[PDB]
RNA sequence: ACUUAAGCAGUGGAGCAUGUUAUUUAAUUCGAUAAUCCACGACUAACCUUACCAUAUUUUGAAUAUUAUAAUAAUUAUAAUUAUUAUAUUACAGGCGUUACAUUGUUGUCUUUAGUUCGUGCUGCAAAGUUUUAGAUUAAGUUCAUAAACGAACAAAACUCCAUAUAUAUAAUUUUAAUUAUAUAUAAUUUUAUAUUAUUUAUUAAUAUAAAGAAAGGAAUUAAGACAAAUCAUAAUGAUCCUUAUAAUAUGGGUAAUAGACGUGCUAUAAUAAAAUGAUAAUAAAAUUAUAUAAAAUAUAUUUAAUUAUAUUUAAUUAAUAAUAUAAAACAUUUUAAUUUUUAAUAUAUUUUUUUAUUAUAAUAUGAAUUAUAAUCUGAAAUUCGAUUAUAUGAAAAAAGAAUUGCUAGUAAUACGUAAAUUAGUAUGUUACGGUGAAUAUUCUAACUGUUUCGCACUAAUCACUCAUCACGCGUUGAAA
């Protein structure tokens, strides 16, 4: 008789496992593969893999035509994969019925892979104005790209560089902040200023990338250079920050104060007393196609470099912003709800606004044993905070609480509401 | 130089068993997630185990101590004291709660372990160095050589213990396997004599020949780094959290649900290979039996008996004594679809279990999953969810391939079996034990390690330092209508 919260219902985030379209699949094993023969393929495959393994290490853009079809047998199914996660989380917390833009601009390496994935996401029957595809690496991964968006139903028009005569509602980067291992405090700055500047109002950024501790930093780097929270402390909840421009944070952080889990410089990960140190990624589940299959074989993919899975479990980490519109209604709003809403100290175990925007964030698997739950949360009080749910405060929460994954805003109230440790080790850097 | 390349032996498309994953579920107890690949402990999950779900149900509970009332004793003298035993008594006990809660202990994985300190001696003004040598030899630290170096301690080696061959002792050869058993002891790192080729040229290695030999294998045994851990079920202590609940008991359920996905094994796909039979009993080893084992016999399947499975009944043995238990492959005969390569009627023969002549004459008699009936074993209980027997069933499985396992050896393989642990009951799993017993040679590739050469503005040591840029101030000097 006991059943799921439709708030919690609300705050879940998608949990059904990814796949690629089958006409898209189809195409890529027919065509991008089958004319190579696999082993050169794999060769290319472990040397790019191999370059990727070094701790904080990054992706890089596809030189040359093998290794065109290396990205697209290997590493275009994990992009895939979170561009769909991240763009369902923003089409959902921002409503079905207020996402539906017209405007589009997706840069990555790969193909138009936020473009494939947005038409899926969107159905067959979205027909938008603009369907912009940047494509950096090679010019015949725009081939490949118009190969794959053929069978999936061209308007999208694929350049290879972004056109500086028009605006944007949506536009999606991957793997897009950060090209050097050196200039990571403000290159992620001149990259977002680049990409910002032709956001229009109302319009949506989709940032995603790698989700190792190098990425996690890169996500808080860009949020605090993006919303400076320095400039607004004491400022509780999500209001559009100055930057006629105003931003505000949609996911995965509902609030917008200083990062709980940010460490400056990413090489602390790589020390004998930074191996405890936590970052914020998340995590997805993506059905293997074929020719994934058939690529990790053989002793260069399939053996220990020193049973198998249908799937393979990509970690991300992203962040989404959206645009206030241009009016004097929309100002004024901004002005006042600044001014005279003293939202107050959001204490440890305060929910904030009690909806979407300011729910917390399950960033841990929960611990769920017999009569209790307990969840790793980034409270919109801006902490990290550890939440234990337990049958005797009440049947339905802790029914709720048991269901519970890793990325869920878990919306409602908890019995014991302590500061969780999992930012110990940050301090002491 | 791991690992690769080669050679050999395989396995490898199906069914089932057993795991993990996904999904579902009231629960399907617990395990991984920084992009090759990896959530994967089972010496037995029906109940218990059990940790999960549902419903009831217990509240100082498992212990230590305190302070009190009741009985029991012992003493003194009913009372005093001691103890014991209950009932309360509150600190609390308890926790398969938490590693995003840490540190030791350890548990493993990888690298280096002829090398690290110490003491002297010597060289340099000194920081330092300890030199030839960055040597030779071997399959490898297994062995030498040299030189301002030489020592001791650990480590390594030797040594030790197995196995093997012998000697002594022991056994009144009925506990008999004296072909054995277990104590002590010896032996080998084999020793030699020549020939040839190399050699630092003999007082040396490669071989080969001759001689004495039973002599041919094996394990263990140390530290230093570095990574990984919470079924870290390889623990302790501490931190924090629950204290009508995250502690505790009972009933039932679940861990076995299936669209799927991948590992591990068992059974198969027929004739260099399966089936039946083979009583004065072809031939073992290592084990186990007081919380047992179960012999022979009788009876029913069932049928003259045999075999196989239960039932009745316990003979010996608690053991070098009796039982588990007549080891099986091996070997002999017979049969075996595809196969008109066969069987049958007439004749026929110096092939007679046989030959000739004329007519007749894609899944089988492989496979055993699945399904049905009726019985049986354990246990109190076999529905979810065990094993066994008989009578019906009779699926997929044929061709070629990705892929991968192991590699001189009593090893692989074996339609060769035997035994033990866990068990009241269930092994296609694990660990032991013996029987038969092969093949093949290694161009190649190599991370990585060890020495080295050169450079060095770095020294908390390239995630280094220096240089230049951008803003903010404060100064200084030089020209000046
Ligand atoms: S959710 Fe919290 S921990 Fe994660 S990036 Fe946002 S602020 Fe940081
Ligand atoms: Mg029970
Ligand atoms: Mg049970
Ligand atoms: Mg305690
Ligand atoms: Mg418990
Ligand atoms: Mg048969």
């Given at each position: 008789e006991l059943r799921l919260l439709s708030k919690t219902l609300q705050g879940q985030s998608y949990r059904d496992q990814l796949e690629l379209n089958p006409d898209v699949s189809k195409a890529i094993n027919n065509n991008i593969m089958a004319v190579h023969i696999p082993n050169n393929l794999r060769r290319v495959a472990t040397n790019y893999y191999k370059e990727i393994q070094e701790p904080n290490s990054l992706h890089r853009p596809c030189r040359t035509k093998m290794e065109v079809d290396a990205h697209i047998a290997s590493i275009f199914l994990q992009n895939y994969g979170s561009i769909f996660q991240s763009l369902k989380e923003l089409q959902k917390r921002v409503g079905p019925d207020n996402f539906k833009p017209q405007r589009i601009l997706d840069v990555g390496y790969g193909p138009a892979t936020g473009i494939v994935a947005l038409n899926d996401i969107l159905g067959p029957n979205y027909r938008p104005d603009l369907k912009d595809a940047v494509i950096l690496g090679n010019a015949e991964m725009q081939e490949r790209a118009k190969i794959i968006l053929s069978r999936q139903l061209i308007m999208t028009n694929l350049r290879s560089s972004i056109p500086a005569s028009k605006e944007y509602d949506l536009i999606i980067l991957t793997h897009?902040?950060?090209?050097?291992?050196?200039?990571?405090p403000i290159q992620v700055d001149e990259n977002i200023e680049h990409y910002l500047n032709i956001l229009a109002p109302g319009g949506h950024i989709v940032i995603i990338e790698r989700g190792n501790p190098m990425g996690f930093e890169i996500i808080a780097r860009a949020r605090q250079i993006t919303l400076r929270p320095e400039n607004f402390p004491?400022?509780?909840?999500?209001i559009p920050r100055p930057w006629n421009y105003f931003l505000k944070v949609i996911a995965?952080?509902?609030?917008?104060?200083?990062?709980?889990?940010?460490?400056?410089?990413?090489?602390?990960?790589?020390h004998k007393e930074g191996k405890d140190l936590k970052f914020c990624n998340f995590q997805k589940s993506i059905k293997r196609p074929k020719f994934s299959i058939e690529l990790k074989?053989?002793?260069?993919?399939?053996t220990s470099w020193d049973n198998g899975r249908d799937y393979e479990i990509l970690n991300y980490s992203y962040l989404i912003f959206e645009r206030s519109h241009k009016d004097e209604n929309t100002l004024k709003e901004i002005k006042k709800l600044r001014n005279?809403?003293?939202?107050?100290?959001?204490?440890?175990?305060s929910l904030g606004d009690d909806t979407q925007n300011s729910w917390p964030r399950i960033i841990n698997d929960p611990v769920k044993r017999k009569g209790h739950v307990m969840m790793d949360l980034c409270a919109p009080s801006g902490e990290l905070e550890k939440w234990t749910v337990s049958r005797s405060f009440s049947k339905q929460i802790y029914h709720d609480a048991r269901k519970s994954k890793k990325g869920?805003?878990?919306?409602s109230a908890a019995k014991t509401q302590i500061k969780g440790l999992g930012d110990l080790n940050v301090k002491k850097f």
């Open positions: 897009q902040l950060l090209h050097d291992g050196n200039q990571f004491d400022e509780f909840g999500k995965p952080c509902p609030h917008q104060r200083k990062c709980p889990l940010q460490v400056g410089n990413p090489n602390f990960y790589t074989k053989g002793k260069l993919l399939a005279e809403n003293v939202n107050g100290k959001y204490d440890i175990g869920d805003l878990w919306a």
